[PDB]
Symmetry: none
Subunit: 239 residues, 4 copies
Amino acid sequence: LIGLLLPDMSNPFFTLIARGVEDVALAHGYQVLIGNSDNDIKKAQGYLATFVSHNCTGMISTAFNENIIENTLTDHIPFVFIDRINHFKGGQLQAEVVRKGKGKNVLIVHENLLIDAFHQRVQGIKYILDQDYKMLEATLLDNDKKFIDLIKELSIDSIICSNDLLAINVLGIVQRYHFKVPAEIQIIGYDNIPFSEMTYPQITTIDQSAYHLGEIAVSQLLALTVKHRGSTRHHHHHH
Amino acid sequence: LIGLLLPDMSNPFFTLIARGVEDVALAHGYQVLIGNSDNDIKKAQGYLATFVSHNCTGMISTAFNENIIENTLTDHHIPFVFIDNGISTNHFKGGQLQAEVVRKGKGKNVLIVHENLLIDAFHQRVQGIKYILDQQRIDYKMLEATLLDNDKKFIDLIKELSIDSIICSNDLLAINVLGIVQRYHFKVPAEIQIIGYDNIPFSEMTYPQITTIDQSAYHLGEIAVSQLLGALTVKHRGSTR
Amino acid sequence: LIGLLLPDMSNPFFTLIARGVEDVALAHGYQVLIGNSDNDIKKAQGYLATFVSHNCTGMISTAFNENIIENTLTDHIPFVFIDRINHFKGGQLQAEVVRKGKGKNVLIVHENLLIDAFHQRVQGIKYILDQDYKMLEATLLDNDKKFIDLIKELSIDSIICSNDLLAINVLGIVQRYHFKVPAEIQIIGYDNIPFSEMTYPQITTIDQSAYHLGEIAVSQLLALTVKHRGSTRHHHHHH
Amino acid sequence: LIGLLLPDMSNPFFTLIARGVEDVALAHGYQVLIGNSDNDIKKAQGYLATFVSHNCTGMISTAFNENIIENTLTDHHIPFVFIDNGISTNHFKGGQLQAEVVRKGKGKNVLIVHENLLIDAFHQRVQGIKYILDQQRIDYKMLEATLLDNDKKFIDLIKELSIDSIICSNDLLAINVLGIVQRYHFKVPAEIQIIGYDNIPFSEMTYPQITTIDQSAYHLGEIAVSQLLGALTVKHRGSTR
């Protein structure tokens, strides 16, 4: 029996990892206990304690949780960290797409940097870019008027987002304020969740092979490709 | 321990229910185990056994597997609620609401793009739509959402049938459809209006935003754990006329 | 102007650090912006963003926050980590008091191991002890009946707690169920907050020089001693 | 930005107010800056300036510095609430409640161990106690809480005066007092009963637990930010007769 502690069950990237895990597991007669930590230390600790209570044979989680997972190994249970089966290189790829699209003034819209995968990605972006940008915490998208005002004041022509969910949110704000994507503002996400193929234009993104990540993770227990699409400055239209 | 068996955890309608469930559950000292049935009876059967094995004090799921759930759980004296022992808003009434928005938008040729009608919620919603459209003598055709996968063939059909209105079983279908028609240079909503269901956050992120029906998903989660232990609103938005 | 991001403003250990900081700062005409992150990544990010908004000259925080603090240094602000001005050694000292009191069956009641200071301390305990114990997450104290049942089943004679707040809670539970502290059960805390001297018996603890920590922290910006008291098995009574 | 100026953030009564303040504030999109005045006018004056400098949309503090606050803030058109423009429960009534618990416990020789009477809350509470004890012709003496620092001298006084009841300005004083008398082998409550104020969590952690007065501290924090933007209960416990 496997315990799978997901950082954000409302993120399709993680639900897809989870299906890769559940599929392989169920094939080999294994059950999975699934928990959502919401990157909350109290929730993480809660679920992990319970998964121990219930004699899990192995655990899958992200490295937000290493201290507890480690202690639970010694005190009791092998583990795999899904985020460690490279995010810095991913970030470099995002910045290189922006450069290939002739970006001059770039906004890095990021999820919480206390999450290593996000932080490492933003380090990769900065590397290529430092070789003009501003950083903006994802929560600031909530005031769309002030977001658009920033875009104008800074003459932003490129936006790099930590994942596809943020890219999609960003796309709808700038389109609702009448900017042209990609000619005026180009946008790049990460993960390649199916939502990324549903927008007009479709979101240029980095495929992390989520389903295959879950598959490998559970297999250990028992590479990145750019998707160039309409949202960046090759493909013109679909007719 | 509360066993939550979701039909599709990739759908944000269900993970929002799950949030509801989690928040009330923790406020009362419970944890929630999640299963994704992935719309599969074997998988569902697996989680029932998982949840039963691990001494869950109650189960929350949809009625898709009501027979095996009822039978296994009653035997073990474990209560259960079905979120679609019921607690849901009325899906027939929701479908009427979808069709009324279309009527108001002056819909003449309506494509009903639907999820699996094996699922009671989806099927009832469709009868809701047909109830209104038949009375109105508005023409409609029904298309299963898989046939969305080839987008050029979808467009051929839209053109041939002169579709001006599309009613979707949920917001994932509506959103997908929106991207397709926009990509083939249809104007939304003047040429084609589209309506979804669920009011997931993605529905407010598209341009135009997707007109939908909020069915109090978070609170559905809250009620289920409340019933377990002891409202429909049209969101009028840019995608409709 | 200093930003001081406290992990838990309801912990007297941190409020005392804060006074050391505020005192030295105010002496040198410096203001302090004080924020409570509650070790919540969203709160931490919120406060740190704001402290940046408001042109802080330097920041003081714990290493829960390193990724954001670091990024804010490069993008903008020097920092000091209060938890890094040794916790593993502290843990060894707690275990050595227990051994000196002839502990046989030990309960390690711990705060959240996702917090490095707590985790490192518990590693220090395990080191000495491994050279019989059970670990118990602090949240489990809430069911006092089951806590006392565990104490009985396991014949617990020693309890090591991550800090004085937990030690004090533990003391009142076992005393209300009629156990004799220290003859039947001995208890050790950490930090040496003033509450530790208020109980009967007084709580044996490890002084971290909290006020002096705050003083040093702000000074950088511009050792452990056992307190043997009544709660462990030298001093007999106060008459 | 909301400026919260606490008189003593080492006191859990105030950090609980602060939690109240933080939770409502964030729910509405605000952050809270905290200042500890450390019971000091220079420090308080510093934070007013800090909070004013940094364009706080409102201030929350105690009325200790009401004159300089009122004057500086009114000039800058910044509103403010005083948690002890007031929002508090009544401290005089709280003191009556303390003395009634003692009367019921058959108190005959009462020591009133008090915080700084410069602080209105503390002084009013003391008049509350004296109101009841005078009517009852119960004897009492007043002791400032600093003279708690030498515990053998405190005990000498307790013995000389045959004290059987101790009313404390807050739970930090009560708790300290409890440890002192217990350490010198007085039996609580049969020999000496003790009552505090505030109902901080430490009051439920001692043995015996400390009888106190809950003054809705968390909710005090909530109301203050609500007033800013737009109940007393005896807890009867083992430490009293």
